[PDB]
Symmetry: C3
Subunit: 267 residues, 3 copies
């Protein structure tokens, strides 16, 4: 695994070197301490914003990547087993370059969708929707390996830190932006296309009225599918195994229970 880490850290470092200036800084930002997965991934993906400049080298990216790998491996092993952990973490490592590319697009979307943002640096440093998506994109790779415990725990850390509630099972394309974010809920089987803009208190999920009865069916597709270029306004509750088309605008406090066709505004 250490040799694969070296190769992945090398690729991520070369990407860092080739990133546009907006993804770089010569500033030494105030040191913060957040939960482990975010702390580590912040340094790995955007070292200029979370490390002293005198320290960014490839070797240091590799060093942080190793600390992260060892931590996730340990946690996956606790809930599962040693072999399953190795395979899942190799899968995360495999996807880190593509995630890095996607996270860049999420930043572009954040700046493009928010008149309050002065530059990418502030989004990177402290935008809660962005902190959540960083961790989500890794948690999802775990889910894709069949893991069902630690990937949820990781997202519950995100949940506590940002009040954004994204199940690791959700599938989310790039140029993704959650603004403000408190009360956002995105379910296990939610599917979200490119250029989705989501506001505070938005649910892309499900409700289960008590059938007593007692014990609800496990899993199955039961959360919305959302197309490209969708904007979901504050307080909107989109519920059930329903399809929202592309280029859809959803108004504030809307209660959506059925399919919504492409190229529409709902209020």
């Amino acid at each position: 695994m250490d040799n694969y880490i070296y190769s992945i850290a090398h690729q991520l470092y070369e990407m860092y070197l080739q990133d546009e200036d907006a993804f770089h800084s010569k500033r030494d930002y105030p040191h913060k301490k957040v939960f482990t997965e975010l702390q580590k991934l912040r340094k790995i993906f955007f070292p200029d914003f979370f490390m002293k400049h005198q320290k960014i080298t490839e070797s240091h990216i590799a060093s942080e990547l190793t600390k992260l790998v060892d931590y996730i491996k340990d946690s996956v092993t606790a809930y599962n087993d040693e072999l399953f952990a190795h395979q899942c973490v190799m899968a995360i490592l495999e996807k880190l370059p593509s995630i890095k590319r996607t996270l860049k697009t999420d930043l572009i979307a954040a700046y493009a969708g928010d008149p309050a943002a002065p530059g990418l640096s502030l989004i990177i440093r402290c935008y809660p929707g962005f902190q959540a998506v960083i961790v989500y994109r890794i948690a999802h790779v775990l889910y894709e390996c069949g893991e069902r415990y630690y990937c949820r725990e990781m997202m519950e850390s995100v949940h506590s830190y940002t009040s954004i509630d994204i199940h690791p099972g959700a599938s989310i394309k790039g140029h993704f932006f959650i603004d403000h974010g408190v009360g956002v809920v995105i379910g296990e089987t939610a599917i979200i296309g490119e250029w989705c803009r989501i506001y505070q208190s938005v649910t892309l999920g499900a409700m289960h009225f008590q059938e007593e009865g007692g014990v609800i069916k496990r899993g199955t597709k039961r959360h919305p599918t959302v197309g490209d270029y969708v904007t979901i306004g504050t307080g909107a509750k989109v519920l059930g195994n329903i399809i929202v088309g592309s280029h859809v605008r959803i108004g504030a406090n809307c209660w959506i229970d059925r399919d919504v066709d492409s190229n529409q505004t709902v209020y």
Copy 2:
């Protein structure tokens, strides 16, 4: 107090030994550090999930229970007095076995109400509705002793950690489940029956439009009473000294201002 602690820890230990296998694990889970009351109560009620297996003995349950008792006593004394603190903490100790039984039913309700849950172990480890209810059930015993300060502070820790806002005065029966949970508000005089299922952004509370005037009447019954087998959908705002009957289903974003009779679906 130490002799009463020993007796209570003995009872809790015997209950632990007699718990069904779903409430047990041989796994050594990743060590977490959360606010004191939750950290301690997690170990006391579900040691398999928060202690190394080589350490669970009765003596260790007693040890953790002592640390918790000393901490709560100290905090209650700060806001009140030494004698009042002793009585309140003796009352908590008294209720710990019954709370343990109730918390088991809350877990059953959580698993039964959530298709995303793979087993009780994940709910125990990281479900925010469950973390909140653990602390709430103890905070409520303080409120029942007449304490009005520290029990609120304790629940504000829960508030920061999970964004679930349950006043220690609320009365809540068993098989209780808050799914997702961000934005849940449950007021001081709210009464909730058995098998209540509550989603994100649900208020069981009150609003006070300014009478200027100036200073609103203190206390009194002013929050909803809810029966058994009630499901309250995402964003529902249930306000005032009103009665919701049993077997009631409440739809998303609903604004409920008046009594709702038993065996009904509202949207």
Copy 3:
């Protein structure tokens, strides 16, 4: 700067001495550790509640004020420059007495608007709306100096701790109260008068439906202006560059898109 700190700490100390008894306590409260800006400002503005009584002297207020000044200066410098930082922190220091006076009125409003509050001491110690406003009032002085980065980071700390989302650019008058608070969003160009009472899940903000296109106009007045004696009920979404008059009552889950005239109740 140290001589100006001494003078400001002297004034704040004299104000402390002249505060009514409700703003004082002989109790030694349980020690808490929260994010730096709140930790420091809590001690500076309300030392009786966050320091051991044997330690409150003027010299100790000055000591804490220095620690805060050094921290904010360091963070402002990181995002901007040394000279800009000095000017901004001198501006904060300048405003601290007036902020102290305003924070007293916010407490009065909190107690007056909440039947659950037993005394100012509990609001001071743990009410999340109040913790947020303490930090907001300082963050706003930074914004007023033209700072756009660290003042946002500071409020994102508030955001994580309380789930209350107040842009440092918002202008808010005194006797301000957010009850419960989770999901409150108050935008960069929001203007709020005296005696505003706000509940959980209230947005005073804006939504931006995707014009693709791509990159939205930066800034400009785009969030609501709210008059005096306004109460905004749970879940209300007040959006756009609109004017809400004085003595307005807004009902639960309301979706407000246009001007609302003075002396009105909306549902």
